Design a protein around this ligand. Structure first.
Ligand SMILES: CC(C)CCC[C@@H](C)[C@H]1CC[C@H]2[C@@H]3CC=C4C[C@@H](O)CC[C@]4(C)[C@H]3CC[C@]12C
Lengths: 52, 48, 151, 52, 151
């Protein structure tokens, strides 16, 4: 029971870190007017292409 | 005693690698710090 | 011109929001609701890193967004309350020209294009340094004069 | 007692040399208007940027 | 040129302190404490290879700082005691155009921007070569003509 809890918790943390990293990495492009997100960056961030 | 004296620092027992590891570790820190200062002095020297 | 909307607190005006290019921007330090219901109901992405809250403009019904540029040549710019002098990496205004509650107003070049958004400033003696948000060709960046405070 | 003294003395020297290098490679940036210290150098010497 | 930045650091003043860009500058070979209090309390960083001491300008007096540039085209430059001829990358003045104790004075271009600060010079017949502090892109450098004396 404990081993299952701890291993699942570790995975949840890994995901939270990835989502935090994704938001911080992409913000400077989505926050900027007239800016377009690079194709490769959109694939890495797992986000929709450009502004649509 | 049938033998003679052990009076030298040289005859410390084995498993004394702790002494070598500590001495080497500190010596390495000095060697690295010395290199850092030498490189900076070289750059400073060339700049005018 | 006329691309400026008011952001209001419950009991007062707190700051301004502006339509620039394809996105609507307001200062993140301003707490209030946009006077225009069309923008007030719009979701914004908050980033404390640049003191911005940004969202996409409903350009299908909001085609009056201002023009903008990333270029920042030396010279004077129009910031509504007068001219602002730009030199090096800083914008400078007259000491009596700045005030609290004025944050969110854009700085325009001689072509009417927005170059930066005003957040605040710092008193440098005979002149006041202006704290602004601007951008390069790729991403948004912020300029923060020493001792600057939010307006 | 002697070994401890000598080893500590050597460390103190290594630190002093590092601090000397830290000042010598940075001072010219402080003297120059704008204090335009490059990002990587700021991380290495543990120093603050011009707008700090 | 039309502005005074030359603050005395001693009663029997030998050289002057000045405000250039965001830094307070004075020759490292002159003794005394800068007047007007605000500069008096500043800590300075010294470099013996540049004969230069510098400190950060306080924000409230930042607006009084002189303009600075690294640009150094061949031609003539101005200073409080006359003109300066810049030729071959070196600054030269007429003999008798300055004396010991007149050091620390900036040399200005045609836009009123500082390009160099005088430390001393070498008297060669009718002309004197100047020992100056000058700047290149993101670096401080010094020029010292042979036989130059400290001022
Ligand atoms: C972990 C490290 C520090 C262990 C080091 C052990 C050292 C400090 C100890 C262990 C055995 C000791 C030695 C034993 C024998 C002698 C011979 C004597 O006539 C002089 C002291 C001398 C030379 C001693 C010096 C100190 C000594 C070397």
């Amino acid at each position: 029971s404990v081993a299952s809890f701890v291993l699942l918790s570790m995975v949840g943390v890994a995901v939270g870190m990835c989502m935090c990293a994704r938001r911080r990495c992409i913000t400077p492009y989505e926050l900027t007017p007239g800016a377009t997100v690079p194709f490769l960056l959109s694939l890495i961030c797992c986000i929709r292409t450009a502004k649509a | 005693a049938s033998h003679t004296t052990l009076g030298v620092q040289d005859i410390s027992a084995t498993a004394m690698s702790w002494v070598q590891k500590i001495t080497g570790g500190v010596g390495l820190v000095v060697a690295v710090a010395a290199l850092i200062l030498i490189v900076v002095l070289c750059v400073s020297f060339s700049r005018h | 011109n006329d691309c400026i909307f008011e952001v209001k607190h419950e009991g007062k005006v707190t700051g301004y929001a502006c339509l620039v290019g394809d996105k609507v921007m307001k200062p993140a330090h301003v707490k209030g609701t946009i006077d225009n219901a069309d923008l007030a109901k719009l979701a914004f992405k908050r980033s404390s890193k640049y003191d911005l809250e940004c969202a996409q403009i409903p350009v299908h019904m909001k085609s009056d967004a201002s023009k903008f540029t990333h270029e920042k040549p030396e010279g004077y710019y129009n910031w509504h309350h007068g001219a602002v002098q730009y030199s090096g990496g800083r914008f400078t205004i007259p000491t009596g020209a700045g005030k609290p509650g004025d944050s969110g107003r854009p700085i325009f070049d001689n072509k009417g294009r927005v170059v930066a958004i005003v957040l605040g400033g710092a008193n440098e003696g005979a002149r006041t340094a202006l704290s602004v948000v601007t951008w390069n060709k790729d991403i948004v960046t912020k300029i923060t004069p020493e001792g600057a405070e939010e307006w």
